[PDB]
Amino acid sequence: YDIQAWKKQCEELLNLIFQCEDSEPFRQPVDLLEYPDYRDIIDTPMDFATVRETLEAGNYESPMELCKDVRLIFSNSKAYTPSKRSRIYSMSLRLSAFFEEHISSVLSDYKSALRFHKR
Numbered sequence: 001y002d003i004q005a006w007k008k009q010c011e012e013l014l015n016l017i018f019q020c021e022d023s024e025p026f027r028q029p030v031d032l033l034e035y036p037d038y039r040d041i042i043d044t045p046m047d048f049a050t051v052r053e054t055l056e057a058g059n060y061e062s063p064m065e066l067c068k069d070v071r072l073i074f075s076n077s078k079a080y081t082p083s084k085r086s087r088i089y090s091m092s093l094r095l096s097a098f099f100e101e102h103i104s105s106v107l108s109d110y111k112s113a114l115r116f117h118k119r
């Protein structure tokens with residue numbers, strides 16, 4: 001019932017994601033010189049360094065907010081891809097499956113801890 005435990009759990013999951021070769025295209029903001037039309041397609045850029053820095057700054061109040069930003073990395077990739085079999089899109093699908101498999105318990109434990117706090 002530790003209400004604060006999600007933060008270190010999210011730090012550890014971000015570390016695993018940065019160790020994954022599939023996270024390479026998503027570790028830093030998309031290069032606007034290489035993809036000059038990116039901001040025409042994508043309203044809210046997001047990347048894993050921005051997520052990690054937001055967490056370390058103490059600017060997430062809950063793991064749901066961190067989830068929303070990570071899911072935005074994956075939806076931006078889906079929105080930009082010219083095809084459903086593109087290399088970078090396919091890397092984002094595998095990384096998304098890995099992230100969802102691991103964030104499930106972090107979200108459940110946090111929500112359970114908050115319910116216990118208000119019992």
Ligand SMILES: CNc1ccccc1S(C)(=O)=O
Nearest residue numbers: 025035077080081086088089
């Ligand atoms: C070729 N680049 C690509 C393809 C599909 C999805 C995302 C990207 S991006 C601009 O985020 O690197």
